[PDB]
Amino acid sequence: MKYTGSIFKRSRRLGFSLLENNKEFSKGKKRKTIPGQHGNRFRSSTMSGYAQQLQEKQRMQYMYGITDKQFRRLFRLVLKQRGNLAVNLFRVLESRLDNIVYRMGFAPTRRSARQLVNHGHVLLNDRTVDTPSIILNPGDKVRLKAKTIKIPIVKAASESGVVSPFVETNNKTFEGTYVRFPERSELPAGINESYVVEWYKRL
Amino acid sequence: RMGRVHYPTYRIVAVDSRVKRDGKYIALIGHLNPALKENKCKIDEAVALEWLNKGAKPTDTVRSLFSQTGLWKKFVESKK
Amino acid sequence: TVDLINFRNFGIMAHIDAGKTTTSERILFHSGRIHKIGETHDGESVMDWMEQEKERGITITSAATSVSWKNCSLNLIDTPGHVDFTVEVERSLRVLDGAIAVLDAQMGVEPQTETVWRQASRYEVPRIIFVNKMDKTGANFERSVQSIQQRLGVKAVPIQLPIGAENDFNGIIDLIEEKVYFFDGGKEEKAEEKPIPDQFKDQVKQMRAHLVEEVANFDDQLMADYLEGKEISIADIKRCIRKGVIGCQFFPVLCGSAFKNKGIKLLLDAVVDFLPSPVDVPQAKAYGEDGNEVLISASDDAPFVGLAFKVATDPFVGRLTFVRVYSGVLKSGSYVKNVRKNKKERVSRLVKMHAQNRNEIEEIRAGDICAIIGLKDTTTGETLVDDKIDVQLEAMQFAQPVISLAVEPKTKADQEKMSIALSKLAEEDPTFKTFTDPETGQTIIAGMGELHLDILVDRMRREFKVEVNVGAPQVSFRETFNKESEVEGKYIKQSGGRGQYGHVKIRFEPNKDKGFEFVDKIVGGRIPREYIKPVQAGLENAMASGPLAGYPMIDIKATLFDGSFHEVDSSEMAFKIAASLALKEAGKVCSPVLLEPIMAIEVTVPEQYFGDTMGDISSRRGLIEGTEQRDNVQVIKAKVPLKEMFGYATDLRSFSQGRGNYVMQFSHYAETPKSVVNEIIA
Amino acid sequence: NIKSNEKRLRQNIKRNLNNKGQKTKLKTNVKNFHKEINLDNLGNVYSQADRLARKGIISTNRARRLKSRNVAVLNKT
RNA sequence: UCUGAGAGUUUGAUCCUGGCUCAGGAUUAACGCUGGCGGCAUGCCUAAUACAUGCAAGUCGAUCGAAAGUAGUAAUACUUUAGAGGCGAACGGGUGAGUAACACGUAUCCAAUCUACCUUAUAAUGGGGGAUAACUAGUUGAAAGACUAGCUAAUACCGCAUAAGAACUUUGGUUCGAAUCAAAGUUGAAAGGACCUGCAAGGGUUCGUUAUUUGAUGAGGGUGCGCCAUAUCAGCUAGUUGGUGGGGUAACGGCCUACCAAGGCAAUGACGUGUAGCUAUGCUGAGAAGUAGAAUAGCCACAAUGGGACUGAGACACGGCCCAUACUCCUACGGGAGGCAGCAGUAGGGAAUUUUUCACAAUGAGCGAAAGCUUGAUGGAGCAAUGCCGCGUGAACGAUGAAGGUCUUUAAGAUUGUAAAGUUCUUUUAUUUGGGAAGAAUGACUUUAGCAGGUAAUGGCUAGAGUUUGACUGUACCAUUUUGAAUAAGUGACGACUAACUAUGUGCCAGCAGUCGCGGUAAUACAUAGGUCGCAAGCGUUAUCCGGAUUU
């Protein structure tokens, strides 16, 4: 779902989080088991390579709030150019607008960044942007449409976040610039991307 | 027109006035985009001479454009 | 182009066999001086095809028939498409603004003119009186006027008088004007006036006394002139008659024999003069849709407003929607919207439909009635507005037919295409309902005599190419049999890969106090409890089909007196399988008695034709020994069986000349006699 | 729909009659030459058929074929 | 950098040959549940079945006579067409029944083909006659009209003469079945209109006529190779096969005809039969290949069925002509009118696939010198979750888990669940107010200046400015533009095949399913409840071809 509205269930079932860890704040029991009611001693019924491939696929996809058909479209465009497609998929996925928006320290979550972008609260190349499905190119800036610079959330979270090493920003004017491609060893990830590459058999 | 709705297209194509659009022809002279007009047109400037020298004068709507490019001046040299 | 004073929307609304069809036919014949009709000379060379009244009325009805006169062009409509109906004339008089009703002179009890007369009396729409029969037996003026005044009591004011007896009519009198002579026979094509002699001057004075004496309620200066004796001008007295007409309190009577076509043009002059113009009379005061139902009207202005009332179907074109243009001179070809249904109905061609052809006029003036082509989703009641004006719903009274005939076609595919056609027919012409009951599958239709179903089958077979034969009303009865003593239900078979067994003994007791209840009389536990609940349901699944034909067994108690099974055998289903078996056998012995649906019939009668009604009710197995009256009219209640009331509907209709209707309500189910149960099986 | 097709419907009939007349005199000259072969008949055929070949009745190919086949028998003397 | 996924099933167990299904993509697609939004794309696969109504190619008065009008005694300036005449109606537009064959596709040759109109130069645009429509008159009739006499005009028609060059035959130059180049005989051309300079004089200028000469364009013609199945189709064939002479085609040829003569093709599949629009390509596969040949484009085919022919450069002609046949419509019954496989639309069939729509603003075509006119081609609009794609139903804080469901069935506790209750932020979309472009600087028109064979001028070409053409649209986009999370979730599965489990009811019963098969008292496999997972504004369901499949 493009807007799930419930992420804690996915976090508990997958043991992962989009942030470092903020989806367990002791509001009751802090349990790392699966949500719902299926028995706390059961794990699953089928645990083959298909199961773990699917599990990692859902993890990677739901870490970005993307739909499966658009993911297949992205893979199809990835097959155009060649190289180390395993890390190239990550590099292209991170080039989406909201990903770099978080990497800019603008907003903690991609969902919040999408909400900001869609409602017309972002300017890029003197054109209004309403979708994060933009293939960012090296050497592009992003403005903030200073009328909407009065958003309390971005103003508060500009300093209290972490800036990725492959991006820069003059957060005083709240404008950032893409420096270079992202790297695997600089971002927090442990996903077996080979499973993602092998699973999709549409191509 | 050809191409895309609200984004028209018409290739500058060598053809004789006998058939419909987008069919049999002889040569592909070039193309013009009316969607962005800044006095520029894809013209070979050489094959158009051969097309003009064997009859089959182009579509009437391009005469001013060819005069802007400078093809009429060198084409009327025959009648000089 | 035209002045709204000239254009007029009138019509003829009268009972059949009183000349309504004939007078409309001949009026179109002799008034065809406009090329759309052109019947005056082009109907004499051709031979007029006379087939029936049904087909001619179906294919000649034109909601907009425009005729040209000296200055004023008229637009007429012939609404009555049945023996008599209330909602069709409701729509018509709601959209039209002129009523001409004829009086009977052959079967002069006036059955179906009185109904429309009372409707108009409650409607208060301008209406005039004319008589088709003048040169025929039983068609004298004095008896007619005396009878209508005595019975109806509407304060009519006849103005013109005939010359001669009811068969030697040879001249026409106008009370304020000269006398009309005749050069030829009918067709009234030559007009000339001559002075009046004493032999007519006496009646001129006599009837002018009544003419000007009653008009005293208008412009008292006329009363002063009558007191003085000075001659009163025609203009002022006719304006007073105009005021009376627009006030809907004065009703003049015309003369002429339209059956042999004497007195046509003077009728035109009288109706165009006495009746108001659609520009001087305010439009129909309808209630809007805002939360108040306030009265609104555009007064023939720019905003196009229209309420759908007639929707006919025709091949090669589609849906022809006869609607009234209350206001707005619109364009031929647009996209109007209706808010109550939220869909842009397409305006493709605004046409006038005539008897022999069609004519699509480019623009139609406000206050007119016309058809539109297309309109694929039109339902009667929607407001057609696209000039930024709120919608409206005019509703004062409506009626739905309850006279029911239960029939069935003779082929399955015939039934399918009949359903496909009747859904569209109900979508286009709401004048009846349709019911499908799960008894066997039957169309319970709403009719008005046999003629309604004849129109149904005609409009089906002539257009849709369908073969169909109507059926008889088929209904069921409930069942209840004698309380037995014992039954012997045995199940013996080696099947199912195991042992199948069951031994059931039940005394079956029907009750009329409560519904079904199961009683367990197995005290020793010889049968398991877990095997009881299914076979219970089996009886509950066998209470729908009896032992004779499947008649409904309703609210019957079951008490399992004795039973036995096999410890390692006797599969459970066999129990319920046996449950229907034994219940049949003893059920055959029980000889059940039926339970018929008894209903109540409320009939309002003027207490002058109650003999036939009471005799028919007595013949229909009812209890009648007197009357119960609502202090001025008798509304008799009768207990009736449903098995014979369907024919009784039309029997009562014909016995009372259609003057008395009724309403059906469900009373209860009552015990049957043996004369009903001997018909239970063939 | 169509408004001037009847113009061509009545136009061709008289022209067709004229062309039939030209063809008939051509055939008469050809038969006269076939009766006996001599220079004057061939010259008359030329003078009366070249005008027909000028206009659109008989193409010049058939005219050339006819005169070649006539001069063949003329030279067969 | 690039090229190949398996699993289940017959037996007590195992191996092996072999078959079936599932795990993949997809459409001319449909069904059931639903249901924000934009762009793009797509929308009779069946009945080549009939088709109501309107629209579907006309144009030229600067071609002609005749006829009306505006103002003007008259001359006249202009708008029009009933007709003649000229051009174009042979294009464009659709539909796939026949056709299994030089039809198509492909490379080619026409010592066998025309090519109006466009490009090149050239001999030139001489002179008369007779014509007939409209109109006038007379019959007939409801109109319809037709019939019969009279008058007219041309770029309509037919003669008179002049010819470079052509055509035709004799003589001589000359060719890898025929062609070049000389002299001669023979023979054929028309038509004017608009404008300028002039008193008249003539000349010039623009269109155009006729004989040419040039290419190009388009069409035709035969051959090489390739291009469905069937042997439960063995011989097929008589203008069929060939020579001679004639005719004829646009040309070459039994294409036709008179005589004469008797083979051609075949087992390497003729011939008969069944099926079928071919091709680029769509889809699948890595590929060899398989499948269908929807849009789109080229070709042929036909235009109610079947025969013919006239017209014109181009037809045997989608809406020209005649006839026959079937069908259908009107009629005052005298006689007529008609062909939606053109655009929408109607009937019927089928499960089923759109509105009886706005304009030539862009492009093309036809005519015209042009102002321009016709354009159901076309550009649009609209319907249609039919497909693809972006896009929303918000976002951030907020319990030892609010209430409650469910479970634990035994409460103690878990779960639904940061989801919610509540706090803050915000308006894609929504509602309201305003500004509001591009698509068209395209074509002409008019004033300026220049160019050209040229003149006294006027006309053609280029450079400059102004006039304008927008159906779409109040579109897009933005704007202290108002309000407020407000206006916005479904559908399949949860035994294994292939991802996620428990309770209750149901007792080989009700019932499930693509496969294994479950249910005879505990069903994780039925019904239902809670929870969970797989996709997503779609989700699943059956049918088609492909992969899996070395299962041709």
Q: What is the CATH number of the domain that holds A82?
A: 1.10.1050.10
Q: In what order do the strands lie in the sheet with C172-173?
A: C161-162, C172-173, C179-180, C193-194
Whether C240 contacts C218, CB under 8 Å: yes
Burial class (CB in 10 A: 0-12, 13-18, 19+), C148: buried
Rounded CA gap, A177 and A160, in Å? Answer: 19
Is A15 (CB) below 7 Å from strand E? Answer: no
Cβ < 7 Å from strand E, B residues 57-76: 57, 59-65, 67-68, 72-73, 76
| Protein-to-nucleotide distance from the CA of B27 to the C1' of E145, whole angstroms | 57
> Residues C210, C212, C217, C223: is their CA dihedral positive or negative?
negative
Rounded CA gap, C204 and C195, in Å? Answer: 12
Rounded CA gap, C310 and C62, in Å? Answer: 11
Q: Which nucleotide is nearest to B4 (CA to C1')?
A: E40
| Protein-to-nucleotide distance from the CA of C279 to the C1' of E431, whole angstroms | 40
First-to-final CA distance of chain C:
75
| Protein-to-nucleotide distance from the CA of A112 to the C1' of E424, whole angstroms | 14
> How many other CB atoms are found less than 10 A from the CB of residue B63?
13
3-class SS string, B33-75: CCCCCCCCCEECCCHHHHHHHCCCCCCHHHHHHHHHHCCHHHH
Q: Report long-range pairs for C143-149 (Cβ below 8 Å, ≥24 apart).
A: C144/C103, C144/C105, C144/C108, C145/C253, C147/C108, C148/C103, C148/C110
Q: What is the CATH number of the domain that holds A136?
A: 3.10.290.10
Non-local CB neighbours of A171 within 8 Å, separated by 6+ positions: A104, A105, A158, A159
* Token pair for C355: 């008897």
Q: Which nucleotide is nearest to A157 (CA to C1')?
A: E396
Whether A154 contacts A106, CB under 8 Å: yes
Let me know whether A78 and A97 are in one domain: no
Rounded CA gap, C652 and C654, in Å? Answer: 5
| Protein-to-nucleotide distance from the CA of A49 to the C1' of E19, whole angstroms | 30
Taking phi over 0 as left and psi of -120 to 50 as alpha, with beta for the rest, C156 belongs to beta
Non-local CB neighbours of C302 within 8 Å, separated by 6+ positions: C327, C328, C329, C387
Whether C410 contacts C328, CB under 8 Å: no
Q: Which nucleotide is nearest to D16 (CA to C1')?
A: E310
Residue A177 lies in a domain: yes
H/E segment holding residue C665? strand C662-671
Rounded CA gap, C346 and A57, in Å? Answer: 52
Rounded CA gap, D77 and D68, in Å? Answer: 15
Nearest to C156 by CA among C274, C250, C276: C250
DSSP 8-state class, residue C12: B
Q: Which chains touch A (3 or more CB pairs under 8 A)?
A: none
Let me know whether A176 and A102 are in one domain: yes
Residue A134 lies in a domain: yes
Taking phi over 0 as left and psi of -120 to 50 as alpha, with beta for the rest, C552 belongs to beta
| Protein-to-nucleotide distance from the CA of A47 to the C1' of E23, whole angstroms | 17
Let me know whether A40 and A74 are in one domain: yes
Rounded CA gap, C551 and C544, in Å? Answer: 7
Residue A33 Cα distances to A53, C203, C215, C415, angstroms: 20, 112, 100, 63
Let me know whether A16 and A76 are in one domain: yes
Rounded CA gap, C657 and C605, in Å? Answer: 12
DSSP 8-state class, residue C216: G
Let me know whether A175 and A194 are in one domain: no
Q: Which nucleotide is nearest to A58 (CA to C1')?
A: E534
Annotated binding site of C for GTP: 14-21, 78-82, 132-135
| Protein-to-nucleotide distance from the CA of C70 to the C1' of E332, whole angstroms | 29
Q: Residue C406: what are its φ and ψ, rounded to 5°?
A: -100, 110
Annotated binding site of C: 14-21, 78-82, 132-135
Residue A146 lies in a domain: yes
Nearest to C378 by CA among C463, C319, C335: C319
List the domain range (segments joined by +) for residue A118.
Answer: 93-184
Q: Which nucleotide is nearest to D51 (CA to C1')?
A: E188
Residues shown for chain D: 77
> Residues C335, C337, C342, C345: is their CA dihedral positive or negative?
negative
| Protein-to-nucleotide distance from the CA of A56 to the C1' of E26, whole angstroms | 29
Residue nearest to nucleotide E501 (CA to C1'): A38
Helix C221-228, helix C234-246: angle, nearest 10: 140
Q: Residue C378: what are its φ and ψ, rounded to 5°?
A: -95, 130
Is A42 (CB) below 7 Å from strand E? Answer: yes
Whether C652 contacts C603, CB under 8 Å: yes
Give nucleotides in strand E with any atom < 7 A to a protein C-beta. 1-2, 5, 24-25, 39-41, 52, 55-59, 83-89, 91-93, 114, 118-121, 157-159, 167-170, 186-189, 210-211, 215-218, 246-252, 296-299, 310-313, 319-321, 331-332, 345-348, 355-358, 362-366, 377-381, 388-401, 406-407, 414-420, 424-428, 438-444, 452, 461-463, 477-480, 485, 489, 494-502, 506-509, 520-521, 524, 530-537
Q: Which nucleotide is nearest to A44 (CA to C1')?
A: E500
| Protein-to-nucleotide distance from the CA of B78 to the C1' of E121, whole angstroms | 12
Is D2 (CB) below 7 Å from strand E? Answer: yes
Let me know whether A178 and A106 are in one domain: yes
Q: Which residue has the tokens 């090329």?
A: C35
Whether B32 contacts B41, CB under 8 Å: yes
- What's the gap between Cα C640 and its chain centre? 25
Non-local CB neighbours of C102 within 8 Å, separated by 6+ positions: C12, C14, C15, C18, C19, C20, C23, C113, C130, C131, C132
Is D25 (CB) below 7 Å from strand E? Answer: no
Residue type, position C23, single letter: T
Cβ < 7 Å from strand E, B residues 5-24: 5-6, 8, 10, 16-24
Rounded CA gap, C262 and C170, in Å? Answer: 9
The residues that bridge with C533 in the sheet, in sequence order, are none
Rounded CA gap, C429 and C559, in Å? Answer: 55
Cβ < 7 Å from strand E, A residues 141-170: 147, 150-153
Let me know whether A54 and A104 are in one domain: no
| Protein-to-nucleotide distance from the CA of D7 to the C1' of E78, whole angstroms | 29
| Protein-to-nucleotide distance from the CA of A26 to the C1' of E492, whole angstroms | 36
* Token pair for A100: 């770099």
Let me know whether A156 and A77 are in one domain: no
Q: Which nucleotide is nearest to D52 (CA to C1')?
A: E188
> How many other CB atoms are found less than 10 A from the CB of residue C314?
13
Nearest to C335 by CA among C290, C277, C375, C395: C375
Residue A175 lies in a domain: yes
Is C229 (CB) below 7 Å from strand E? Answer: no
Q: Which chains touch B (3 or more CB pairs under 8 A)?
A: none
Let me know whether A178 and A101 are in one domain: yes
Q: In what order do the strands lie in the sheet with B2-4?
A: B2-4, B7-14, B27-32, B42-43
Whether A61 contacts A14, CB under 8 Å: no
Rounded CA gap, C576 and C536, in Å? Answer: 8
Residue A2 lies in a domain: no
Q: Which nucleotide is nearest to B59 (CA to C1')?
A: E364
Cβ < 7 Å from strand E, C residues 559-588: 571-573
Let me know whether A105 and A146 are in one domain: yes
Nearest to C576 by CA among C622, C546, C542: C542
Non-local CB neighbours of D58 within 8 Å, separated by 6+ positions: D23, D26, D49, D52
Structural domain count of chain A: 2
Q: Which nucleotide is nearest to A119 (CA to C1')?
A: E428
DSSP letters of C483-517?
Answer: --S---EEEEE--TTS-EEEEEEEEEEE-SSS---
Rounded CA gap, C183 and C169, in Å? Answer: 13
Whether C298 contacts C305, CB under 8 Å: yes
* Strand C518-520 versus strand C500-510 pairing type: unpaired
Q: Which nucleotide is nearest to B7 (CA to C1')?
A: E439
First-to-final CA distance of chain D:
63
| Protein-to-nucleotide distance from the CA of A146 to the C1' of E46, whole angstroms | 63
* Strand C500-510 versus strand C489-493 pairing type: antiparallel
